[PDB]
Amino acid sequence: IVNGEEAVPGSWPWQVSLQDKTGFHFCGGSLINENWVVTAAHCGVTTSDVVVAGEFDQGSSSEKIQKLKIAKVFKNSKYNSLTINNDITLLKLSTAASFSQTVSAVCLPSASDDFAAGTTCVTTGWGLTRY
Amino acid sequence: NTPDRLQQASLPLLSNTNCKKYWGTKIKDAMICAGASGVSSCMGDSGGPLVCKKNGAWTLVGIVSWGSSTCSTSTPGVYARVTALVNWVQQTLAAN
């Protein structure tokens, strides 16, 4: 995020980091329950990648994080790689997350819920802060 | 290098019709745009949440997807529109 600010630690408890086997953060995701993470299909997650829950500072070794293995990747069958449309994947965890003060789920909308243009929302992540 | 500490930003939703002024026919019905407000999602944010408060609870409205290649803060970012996708989520959870 360019021109954002640091979050309060633990205040976005559904936010996960997707890391490869070398420990490199490559995408975010969100917990929707103890067993499932939603992310973008174009992130290209495989069962060799790791879900890191409960993280705040990726440079600190002191945080009580959960490193969760991925059992199966469910890429939406309507995902179109050419247009990047329907850009959603579900990850079924091998190891359930343990919910706590710093690890818990985001709500899903109903299919008929409305979010109007001009509404102020929030986004979070460990993406670049400058290009 | 990605930052060590988790970042946040508040930003407005746009309509797809207005987002098309920036991105033309690249905007599909399963996309929602947000930003162009002095902040931007950027590389490494992909897959993470765009949440809006609804009846007191944070609700997943978008999944960070794509946008400007330089993360321009005057151009809207594009997110997967979760309301268009939530049937599939529910069906997948129920079957697995």
Partner: peptide, 10 residues
């Protein structure tokens, strides 16, 4: 869902 134990500050 959706209600953090540690409230965000925006």
């Amino acid at each position: 869902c959706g209600v953090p134990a540690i409230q965000p500050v925006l």
